[PDB]
Amino acid sequence: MRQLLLISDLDNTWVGDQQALEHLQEYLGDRRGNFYLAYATGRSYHSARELQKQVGLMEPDYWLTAVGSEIYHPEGLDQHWADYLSEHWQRDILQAIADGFEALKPQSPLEQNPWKISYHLDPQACPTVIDQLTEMLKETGIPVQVIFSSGKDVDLLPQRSNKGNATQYLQQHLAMEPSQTLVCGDSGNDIGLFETSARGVIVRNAQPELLHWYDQWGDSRHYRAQSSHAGAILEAIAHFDFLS
């Protein structure tokens, strides 16, 4: 219903260069009705809101949060995405099984949601505990994925849940064409975004994992910005002739 669907990662992409962030937001603010804006972050909705207060993030149309587990718009959680993630999802039994692992301790309630069961691995425990949990869960027909990061954090999420999938869902939901979509990212975790049928911008400060993906699979739709952080988004908007 608008000219552009702008989907951007937050940390180290939209955020990182405060001056550039302000320049980008002032520009977009004067043409607000011409594009849909979605922040796609690994942060929980609450954490994303805290970052908004921290750096003054402009209000987006959508928030793709918590490893794609929850999509929010100003009036609430998107129910179609929720139903999609709920299909064959069994949070109670998964939580009950994971709770049984002495080496796993539940993360704060702030990090939990209907489609995300999170834990902390005991620093004195062995990662094989995660192998055991993962193998056990694969012995079931439950579409769950186990994500172990930083050698301490454990997320149990629907297999359907991730940033790229949430982005693809949003794109079709809003009926926006690939040529009208622009994804922005910096890390290996943003590769899913770039697998979206859309134009994309890789910020200059991108992590090697994303750069290696770009060098091998990137095509005409993927712009290697000269500028870093938010500056790369302004650069890409001009490059792809958006909002002109």
Binding site, by residue number, is 9, 11, 186-187, 189-190
| Choice between 94 and 236, CB closer to Mg ion | 236
| Choice between 11 and 22, CB closer to Mg ion | 11
| Choice between 181 and 187, CB closer to Mg ion | 187
Shortest reach from residue 9's CB to Mg ion, in Å: 4
| Choice between 119 and 214, CB closer to Mg ion | 214
**Cα–chain center distance at 192:** 9
**CA proximity to 120, closest of 91, 112, 41, 159:** 112
C-beta separation of 223 from 199 below 8 A: yes
99-102 CB contacts, 8 Å cutoff, 24+ apart: 101/129, 101/132, 101/133
Shortest reach from residue 13's CB to Mg ion, in Å: 5
C-beta separation of 37 from 212 below 8 A: no
Give the residue numbers of the binding site for Mg(2+). 9, 11, 186-187, 189-190
Contact footprint for Mg ion (CB under 5 A): 9, 11-12, 186-187
**Following CA atoms 168, 182, 74, 190 in sequence, which dihedral angle do they give, to the nearest 10 degrees?**
60
| Choice between 20 and 103, CB closer to Mg ion | 20
Shortest reach from residue 41's CB to Mg ion, in Å: 8
Query: CA geometry: angle at 57 spanning 85 and 10, to 5°?
Result: 50
Q: How far apart are CA 185 and CA 203, in angstroms?
A: 6
Q: Provide DSSP, 25-88.
A: HHHHHTTGGGEEEEEE-SS-HHHHHHHHHHHTPPPPSEEEETTTTEEEETTEE-HHHHHHHHTT
At 8, is the secondary structure helix, strand, or coil? Answer: strand
Shortest reach from residue 123's CB to Mg ion, in Å: 26
**CA proximity to 159, closest of 188, 116, 127:** 116
Shortest reach from residue 12's CB to Mg ion, in Å: 4
Shortest reach from residue 5's CB to Mg ion, in Å: 19
Pairing of strands 4-8, 35-40: parallel
| Choice between 158 and 185, CB closer to Mg ion | 185
State which residue has the least CB distance to Mg ion.
12
